Amino acid sequence: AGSLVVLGSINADHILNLQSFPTPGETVTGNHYQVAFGGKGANQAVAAGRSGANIAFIACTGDDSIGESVRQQLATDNIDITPVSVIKGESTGVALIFVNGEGENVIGIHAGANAALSPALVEAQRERIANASALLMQLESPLESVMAAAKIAHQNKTIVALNPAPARELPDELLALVDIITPNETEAEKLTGIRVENDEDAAKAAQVLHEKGIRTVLITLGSRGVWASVNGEGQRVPGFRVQAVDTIAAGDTFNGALITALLEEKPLPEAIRFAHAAAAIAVTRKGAQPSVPWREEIDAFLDRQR
Template sequence: MSTLLVVGSANADHVLTFDDLPQAGETLISQQYRLELGGKGANQAVAAARLRNAKQTISFISALGDDSNAAMMRNSWAADGIELEGCYQIADQSTGTAMIFVNQQGENSIGVVPGANAYLSAVHFQQQQAKFAQASYMLIQLETSLESVKAALQLARQHQCISLLNPAPAAMLSKEILSLVDIITPNETEAYALTGVEVSDQLSASKAADYFHRQGINKVVITLGSKGAYVSEQGKGQLIPAPIVNAIDTVAAGDTFNGALMVALDEGKSLQEAVIFANKASSIAVTRHGAQSSIPYRDQLNN
């Protein structure tokens, strides 16, 4: 058996759909409202759980609030077979919350209230140190504090657990944090925030990847939406196209990609093969509404 570890956020997503996304100062009437289970960490854990093989176990470390949303989330994750010993409940705090606006083209704007996510800390990771020691890969994002991200990366490095950092939402990261990362997976916006390179094509993606390599990161995957992903390993890069689909909702597409990528790498696939697998999974997610509800199961990738 192989253990895969996801560390990060969990949110209750309030999703509103519109013809067009509201502009600054504009009030629009939403066509539909729904409550979804989300948060980048939770989405990635669910993606890994649904896309894993029979020999892989998914563990999730997160902080939930003292409310009904926390119980709903735990029940849903347990149904997907996620190991939840590392999911903490923080007294007198609400579970993280996100407001998501989605237009008819599947584009979205998201605002997040961290809630209990802000309380995930190195203390929790030390209590779950056995998980880091057992795991072959750890996947983490930036919806918890940078202090917690650094602590998790340090613990992963200490236990020779390969780390994947999905630097979302975009934030400035210190060289110290980047030096602890084995694989980084920004999108165009996040790559620009971290490198100063405006990524629009293969050439600019290569320049952004070179920046990460100079920070000591051997493997770089820059996701480019419908164009696919630029993959660079030890300075050698290529663009891997994504399947052509009719996207209706891009929420959790990146999270699906990252969860799938970790699963495939743990199976021994090359980085290029893992990206092809992840592209296929995320291309299914964008054809469905919702966050975790859009994430496919492994057997659906072959349909």
């Protein structure tokens, strides 16, 4: 397989399980409480490393205690943490997360040291990005750095995979550099203006994105799987039917495992099925980063799928 570079956030997730999300001005008594490592960057780097990728992660942590402990944890997930920088005088990004009784979540993040991953730190990784087969990024890192890295990858024929989360509009300059884009329905709408509630709307939104220069458009549809579209031709690839207990990190798992399968030269439909299997396991498990499956578990799940 070729080599993967993930560039993105690292957060300290503070997660409280409760029955129902609190409404304005209300206090709700929750149950289980956990502090764990997270961040869309780190979650996708862990999904790639645990599923078998050859992956290195460009990220910034603070030098608070959790910042000084997270690189050691990530190295054990088969991630080359050489390009994870520790920013002195700053604290690691934070997420405050509520998970309801049905397994849905709401997340509020604070950038912290993730905001120090700058164009200059990207430029210091130019050779690493140029030599990689693929670059996977999200939108929890400064837009300027995402753009700087997409440009380096574009110049060197490094595949640019962008999971455009959390949702925001992006400049056409950045969208023209992306090879693979993986919005959920909300993100697809934010990027194109087309609400996606069915496969017909998914093809409409996909076409706008293809019109921006993006060849492979994968619009994730929750329990309905994904609308896969390559330069206009699209199809729905259903996910696996499982009993969801906590949907957090589903998307992150899908992305990291998706790129691992593509870098092993599995064709797109098969890579999507591999990623659907990894994400299906993840939604049957509690927590975000801890819920990401290992390669042997993903294969065992696929092997049982007849």
